[PDB]
Amino acid sequence: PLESQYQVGPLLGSGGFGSVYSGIRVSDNLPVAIKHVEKDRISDWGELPNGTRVPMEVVLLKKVSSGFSGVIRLLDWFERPDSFVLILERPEPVQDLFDFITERGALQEELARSFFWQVLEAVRHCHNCGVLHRDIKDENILIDLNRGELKLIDFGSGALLKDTVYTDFDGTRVYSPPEWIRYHRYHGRSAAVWSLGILLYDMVCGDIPFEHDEEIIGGQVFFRQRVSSECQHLIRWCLALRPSDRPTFEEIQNHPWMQDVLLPQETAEIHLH
Numbered sequence: 001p002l003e004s005q006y007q008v009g010p011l012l013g014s015g016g017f018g019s020v021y022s023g024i025r026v027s028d029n030l031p032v033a034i035k036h037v038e039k040d041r042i043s044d045w046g047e048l049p050n051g052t053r054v055p056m057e058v059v060l061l062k063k064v065s066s067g068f069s070g071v072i073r074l075l076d077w078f079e080r081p082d083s084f085v086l087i088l089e090r091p092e093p094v095q096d097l098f099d100f101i102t103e104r105g106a107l108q109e110e111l112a113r114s115f116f117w118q119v120l121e122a123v124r125h126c127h128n129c130g131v132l133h134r135d136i137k138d139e140n141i142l143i144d145l146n147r148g149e150l151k152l153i154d155f156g157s158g159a160l161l162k163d164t165v166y167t168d169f170d171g172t173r174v175y176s177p178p179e180w181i182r183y184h185r186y187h188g189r190s191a192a193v194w195s196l197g198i199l200l201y202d203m204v205c206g207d208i209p210f211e212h213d214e215e216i217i218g219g220q221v222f223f224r225q226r227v228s229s230e231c232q233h234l235i236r237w238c239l240a241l242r243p244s245d246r247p248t249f250e251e252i253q254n255h256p257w258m259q260d261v262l263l264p265q266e267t268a269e270i271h272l273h
């Protein structure tokens with residue numbers, strides 16, 4: 001049973017993704033997050049290697065589970081009559097990147113570089129596992145404050161990665177690319193790189209660059225804080241209007257701005273501790 005295996009704590013958050021609670025695995029006192037999703041709110045279903053019918057979210061989380069700590073780990077899941085329950089890893093202490101940037105303002109380039117590098121490694125892992133996240137943004141990134149490790153969360157709007165066009169999108173509009181706004185069409189990799197440009201701007205400027213549809217399609221990035229010419233170059237390249245003009249993950253990680261990254265433990269000692 002589920003109520004015997006986990007001590008439930010306070011609500012951490014609710015919205016489009018469902019309702020998430022703090023919790024403890026009674027056996028070993030491991031910190032967990034307990035996510036509830038109503039069967040009515042699930043449009044996308046899949047099958048396990050098992051051949052069992054589950055939310056696409058469970059399929060995608062199982063595909064990315066491994067030693068690699070850059071993606072949130074699914075520990076267990078349960079089917080109830082009207083809902084699924086997901087048991088997820090909970091770092092402690094933790095802060096989400098949205099809240100961290102709200103509290104600290106625009107990050108120093110050395111810290112933005114460390115965080116952005118870790119997000120690139122996590123997104124490479126997803127893509128290597130056949131998973132497209134589709135909602136990369138500061139709210140979906142947790143910081144393990146003691147280890148200086150970032151984790152990607154909320155795979156519930158993701159998809160199997162494919163090389164053909166996507167004509168459905170239920171991620172965050174203001175991190176969505178101009179080809180989605182104009183044509184309701186995108187390709188996975190080039191739409192992910194757009195969302196990474198929005199995230200890097202968010203880190204170095206303290207907020208997202210565009211609010212309205214017309215700004216997204218307009219082809220102009222204004223820098224509201226002091227940002228190095230190399231960092232501006234990378235951001236403007238990720239936010240190229242034409243998807244085929246955007247860098248690959250390899251071209252981002254080889255960019256001159258991305259050189260000499262801090263290790264996670266150095267990031268924690270210098271910036272978080």
Ligand SMILES: [Mg+2]
Nearest residue numbers: 016017156157
């Ligand atoms: Mg979602």
